[PDB]
Design an enzyme around this catalytic site. Structure first.
Site, PDB file in Angstrom:
ATOM      1  N   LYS A  95       0.799  -1.215   0.000  1.00  0.00           N
ATOM      2  CA  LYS A  95       0.000   0.000   0.000  1.00  0.00           C
ATOM      3  C   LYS A  95       0.840   1.278   0.000  1.00  0.00           C
ATOM      4  O   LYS A  95       0.537   2.215  -0.724  1.00  0.00           O
ATOM      5  CB  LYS A  95      -0.973  -0.033   1.179  1.00  0.00           C
ATOM      6  N   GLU A  98      -5.215   7.491  12.553  1.00  0.00           N
ATOM      7  CA  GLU A  98      -4.837   6.157  12.164  1.00  0.00           C
ATOM      8  C   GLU A  98      -3.404   5.701  12.451  1.00  0.00           C
ATOM      9  O   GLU A  98      -2.648   5.427  11.517  1.00  0.00           O
ATOM     10  CB  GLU A  98      -5.178   5.982  10.668  1.00  0.00           C
ATOM     11  N   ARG A  99      -3.018   5.579  13.713  1.00  0.00           N
ATOM     12  CA  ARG A  99      -1.659   5.072  14.033  1.00  0.00           C
ATOM     13  C   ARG A  99      -0.468   5.977  13.751  1.00  0.00           C
ATOM     14  O   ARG A  99       0.076   5.961  12.643  1.00  0.00           O
ATOM     15  CB  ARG A  99      -1.398   3.718  13.340  1.00  0.00           C
TER      16      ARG A  99
END
Lengths: 479, 470, 470
Positions: free
Chosen positions: C164, C190-191
């Protein structure tokens, strides 16, 4: 009841497109009020010490204290001929940028639908020009045929081609895209221009970006404009590119007003929201000058779940539905029509005899073929015979986008494959045979198609002749 | 005086405040008849049904039309009675709205007319008839396999190209004839398009002279759709009550009745119950349904068309409804394709009345048998299309034989069918109906070709049908 | 003056009361900069976005940082404009938070800097481009089977050991090169761990000089996570608008955007809707998504990484999202295991643009064919592992043969791959892409060993790959 607060209010709360104002003592529920900054608003809730106003545009220019003035007009929209070829927002304000809409008459958004006696059964069909639909799923003037399917199933295109195919007939098309993307709207209105369609089409727009109120209103402003021509001798077709988006906008606006939800967050009046909307599509009595407003409601299905709330609601209103299969699309079958589930009720008394006779067997030829094939990877010998033209029918129904086909030449092609006049030619050359036979008929059969046309029938001279005339081409075709 | 004034307008809900402690009772009609005093107003003419007493001399009301144009302050007048409507010969052959105003073009009802209030308590216990007596419809399938009860509630299932209108039409006819009973048709929130079709279908079938109609269609505000079943009920009640007739009450889509209820409940500010329905669901149904019955004098039988929320029958609305049904008539688009009209499924259509204690061994015995023989035939088909009819266990063939005559003998000449068939139409009485199937089961007609018992009346007509092509 | 004061503090929601009827508009920024006057207080520096006007000169506000330490009475100041942020060359190669402050260590942006308000109406109808024109990424799989549209919305599916990041990186590269377009990366809830990795991965890939980044990670209050997509959108808009470029907008996990929305809605006191989402879901999405488009001048194409609520795609959030997607790119951890990178599923990745009306018969025809030949091969495997490859219906073997070359020819030399492969990297234009598969399908390369079309560019390179081990 004249000048004071009776006609003037003051905003108490502005937020999420809704506003509550003090005053406005003389407003009528449903009245369009105007905020100081010049944004319009409709008064929904007439509460004892405040008025619930739904803002129809930018709500950031409004602050508490802003003045709100009565206009004295129940929510209405400019109606007229000047709208033709124009792209306007639900309030009749043009957005295409070609200048003001010079309209004189006006009509109220929410209006009563034709009575039980104000109507007459539909009989004149509506030629969609999309083969699979005119033969298998007929639409008559004054009908409401729901077209439902998943995103990217080609629902918009069908209504597009259908609109394009309205240059011959006397139709005033109206395209109301609710919740759509302005981008897509632009490209649609641009392909319409190409095919010389905005000469008879109006386009009301309520893009994804606009506040819920506008989306909520868009269908109604649409029917209004169309009601004009309809309730005045003319014939109107109204396409609502998305009733799910309207429903959803409604839901939003609802909870925003803290109206207790009902099932699935959807208000108790979600059905009536649509019903009252599609009851306005009618077929007026000759006594009222048989005008006709046809309706094509779009319903986007998540994962093809018909059973869903909103889809089941809108199904229990309309006179049948056209089902666009998702897989059918991507594998390569435009129009992705799912014959089986698709159904038209007034369908029948619509078709011209030409279509009536030939299209009859088509359902069966397709029916058998359908049940013969989850068992992807073999079957009876009689069935090996059925699969013959059955495989070729599928190739004739498949149609190319933006290429509307007139009925006359359409009844002949639907004829050929049902009379074996195509079974000799493999599926590989079926679509070629089509383009072929068409131009051949347009020339040689230019005297034969006229018989199909003018009479709308295909009795003896036509059946006998055409039988041997199809040979004129098949017996002159390439391999 | 008894003049209130508008305080609030929340969509169809409108609150009115009354001075001089007049306060109209619950269910009373309130007319708002306002003429615009200026160019900034509109002309209003609206009736509102009082729903509650919120205190401070205020009544929350549900408007029967659109509230667009209401202005806080408009004066409201109390009519003193609930929505009253015309009853009698005057209503026959005519179509009206909830308010009781005709909506056909035949001119308006006179002020001399009697008008009954739609809201009224059901018959007293002491007033009801004690014995359960079946209502004969002269229709074989019905009268044998799913006997209708005089005063009960029949659920009509199926309504898309299966002959639903013909059956209703044929019913309005037989009762009107062999029973001398008027029918009443209530269309509740369900496609104006259809209402128009049926009306016209009734002109040609001629059955409209024996039926008053009321339409509160799909475009009507909640209040209208909710009350129309009461209006049409009242008009029908007058015959049973005053002219002691055994009349009929058709309600097309009672579900929309309950849907219309929840649609209002929410607006009144009621705590939603299961699936957002009104906490008041059961009660509103029972009050409508408990008036439909046979008293000492006459009776009211209703054939309610039911349309469930997407295949689900456990949904509150229909769950509630079934508790009042005495029989179900399922029209199937299969028997119809076969040409067996009425497409009344002889195995799904059920009745609380197919019990020997009511119909006796003669009827009952024959009935469960016709239902059983059809069982074998129904299950065998699969064996048929595989091993054929060759040597199917002797007796089993005898059943496949007799069965086919049976299911065919169940179709009928509808008087309303003559319109396009030629055949005049039948009226086989349950007595002759039972006999026909009795002897058939006895195999006493096993030598005749299928089409002989096809589309007839008694078993005699089959014999007359015999002297044609064999 | 234009000075309000804190009235309430309900977690991230803070109400401010303004004197002298100043009242800041909706979306305006409010700074609270308080210095502790004693040992019992703390130093506060916080921006709040106005959300509503509750009346009585009060605005309900959503804080963009933590509200710990707020004291009823603290004074609030109105900035006059909504959260404004740096745009231009100044943002490239740099990482910032929602407020537009850099969070990398490269020093701070000058006050001369232009700063655009994040909240802004989308382009006017008359302003959009009429023709749908595909955006070429020089990546075979993409450009053939799921053409990206200039200005559309691509859903990127797959993101755990499937490549990705390489695909995003390789994208930022090609557009920057063959199109001269800057990309913008928005990380939404997100992280942080991942945000750090990617940043660094961008240093080495060198693609960071062509991309501005914004992180509103998983530890951010609802307000921060909700607005970061607007910040990164603005920074990107400046190029399309002022420097007419066809730029990119990556949003990693737009779902967290909507989740952040509902998280706030509840706090503002909004009636929860389906699945506790905000009644305002659709609107908030459309307002973000309708700015991403091609106007007369430039364009903005977004590749949104989507992460659904535990396998379910009917959940409101994603249901809403898909309505704006013009194509989907599914990265699969299967083609990757085979070594076919990019692991872009050639049969699941779909596009609104693979239509002859847009790409023509040349492209389209070849495309549906590559999709079809792969169909046979895909379904046969089961037959393969059972009866083997021996005499598989002649033509079918011909397909299993040609197919294997096809799926292999779909992998590519990523410019960002050279970092560890040696191979420089490709950029096959759709024209050459179509040809390659055209001839392959014509069987014009059926005599070459699989690995010959493996990890290359045009079909020429396959021939050059030929003169190696055969």
């Amino acid at each position: 009841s004249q000048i004071q607060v009776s006609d003037v209010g003051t905003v108490i709360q502005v937020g999420d497109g809704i506003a509550r104002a003090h005053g406005l003592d003389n407003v009528m529920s449903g009245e369009a009020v105007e905020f100081a900054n010049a944004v319009m608003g409709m008064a929904l809730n007439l509460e004892e010490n405040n008025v619930g106003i739904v803002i129809l545009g930018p709500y950031t220019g409004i602050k508490e204290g802003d003045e709100v003035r009565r206009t004295g007009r129940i929510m209405e929209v400019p109606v007229g001929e000047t709208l033709i070829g124009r792209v306007v927002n639900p309030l009749g304000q043009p957005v295409d940028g070609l200048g003001p809409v010079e309209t004189t008459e006006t009509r109220p958004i929410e209006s009563r639908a034709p009575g039980v006696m104000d109507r007459r059964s539909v009989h004149e069909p509506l030629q969609t020009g999309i083969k699979a639909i005119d033969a298998l799923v007929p639409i008559g003037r004054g009908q409401r045929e729901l077209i439902i399917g998943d995103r990217q199933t080609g629902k918009t295109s069908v209504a597009i081609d259908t609109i394009i195919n309205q240059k011959d007939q006397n139709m005033i098309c109206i395209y109301v895209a609710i919740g759509q993307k302005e981008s897509t709207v632009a490209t649609v209105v641009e392909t319409l221009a190409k095919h010389g369609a905005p000469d008879y089409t109006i386009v009301v727009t309520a893009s994804a970006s606009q506040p819920a109120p506008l989306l909520f209103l868009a269908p109604y402003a649409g029917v209004a404009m169309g009601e004009y021509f309809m309730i005045m001798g003319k014939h109107v077709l109204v396409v609502i590119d998305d009733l799910s988006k309207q429903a959803a906008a409604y839901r939003q606006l609802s909870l925003l007003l803290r109206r207790p939800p009902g099932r699935e967050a959807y208000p108790g009046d979600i059905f009536y929201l649509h019903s009252r909307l599609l009851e306005r599509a009618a077929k007026l009595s000759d006594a009222k000058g048989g005008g006709s407003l046809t309706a094509l409601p779009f319903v986007e299905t998540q994962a093809g779940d018909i059973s869903a709330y909103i889809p089941t609601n809108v199904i229990s209103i309309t006179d049948g539905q056209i089902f666009l299969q998702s897989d059918l699309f991507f594998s390569g079958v435009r129009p992705a029509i799912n014959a089986g589930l698709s159904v038209s009720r007034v369908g029948g008394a619509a078709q011209i005899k030409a279509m009536k006779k030939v299209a009859g067997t088509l359902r069966l030829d397709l029916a058998a073929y359908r049940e013969l094939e989850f068992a992807q990877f073999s079957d009876d010998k009689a069935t090996q015979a059925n699969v013959a033209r059955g495989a070729r029918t599928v190739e004739v129904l498949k149609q190319d986008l933006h290429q509307p086909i007139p009925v006359e030449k359409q009844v002949l092609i639907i004829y050929a494959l049902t009379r074996g006049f195509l079974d000799d030619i493999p599926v590989e050359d079926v679509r070629r045979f089509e383009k072929e036979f068409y131009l051949w008929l347009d020339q040689n059969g230019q005297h034969l198609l006229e018989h199909i046309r003018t009479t709308k029938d295909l009795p003896n001279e036509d059946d006998l002749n055409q039988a041997i005339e199809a040979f004129k081409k098949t017996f002159v075709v390439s391999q | 005086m008894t003049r209130g004034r508008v305080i609030q307008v929340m969509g169809p809900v409108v609150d009115v405040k009354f001075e001089n402690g007049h306060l109209p009772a619950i269910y009373n009609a309130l007319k708002i008849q306002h003429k615009a005093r200026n160019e900034n107003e509109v002309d209003i003419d609206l009736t509102l049904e009082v729903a509650l007493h919120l205190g401070d001399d205020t009544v929350r009301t549900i408007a029967m039309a659109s509230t667009d144009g209401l202005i806080r302050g408009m004066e409201v007048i109390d009519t003193g009675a609930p929505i009253s409507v015309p009853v009698g010969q005057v209503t026959l052959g005519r179509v009206f709205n909830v308010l009781g105003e005709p909506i056909d073009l035949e001119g308006d009802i006179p002020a001399d007319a009697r008008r009954d209030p739609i809201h009224r308590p059901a018959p007293k216990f002491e007033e009801l008839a004690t014995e359960v007596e079946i209502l004969e419809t002269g229709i074989k399938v019905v009268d044998l396999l799913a006997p209708y009860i005089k005063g009960g509630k029949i659920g009509l299932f199926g309504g898309a190209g299966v002959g639903k209108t013909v059956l209703i039409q044929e019913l309005i006819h037989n009762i009107a004839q062999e029973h001398g009973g008027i029918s009443v048709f209530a269309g509740v929130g369900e496609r104006t398009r259809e209402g128009n079709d049926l009306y016209h279908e009734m002109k040609d079938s001629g059955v409209i002279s024996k039926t008053a109609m009321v339409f509160g269609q799909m475009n009507e505000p909640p209040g209208a759709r909710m009350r129309v079943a009461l209006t049409g009920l009242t008009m029908a009640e007058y015959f049973r009550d005053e002219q002691g007739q055994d009349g009929l009450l058709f309600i097309d889509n009672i579900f929309r009745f309950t849907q219309a209820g929840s649609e209002v409940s929410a607006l009144l500010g009621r705590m939603p119950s299961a699936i957002g329905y009104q906490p008041t669901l059961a009660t509103e149904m029972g009050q409508l349904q408990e008036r439909i019955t046979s008293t000492a004098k006459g009776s009211i039988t209703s054939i309610q068309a039911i349309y469930v929320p997407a295949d689900d029958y456990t949904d509150p609305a229909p769950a509630t409804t079934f508790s009042h049904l005495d029989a179900t008539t399922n029209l199937e688009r299969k028997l119809a394709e076969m040409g067996i009209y009425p497409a009344v499924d002889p195995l799904v259509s059920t009745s609380r009345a197919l019990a020997p204690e009511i119909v006796g061994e003669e009827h009952y015995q024959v009935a469960r048998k016709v239902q059983q023989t059809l069982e074998r035939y129904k299950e065998l088909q699969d064996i048929i299309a595989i091993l054929g009819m060759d040597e199917l266990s002797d007796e089993d063939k005898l059943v496949v034989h007799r069965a086919r005559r049976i299911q065919f003998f169940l179709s009928q000449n509808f008087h309303v069918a003559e319109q396009f068939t030629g055949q005049p139409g039948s009226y086989v009485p349950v007595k002759e109906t039972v006999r026909g199937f009795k002897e058939i089961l006895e195999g006493k007609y096993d030598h005749l070709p299928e089409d002989r018992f096809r589309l007839v009346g008694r078993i005699e007509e089959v014999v007359e049908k015999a002297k044609a092509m064999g």
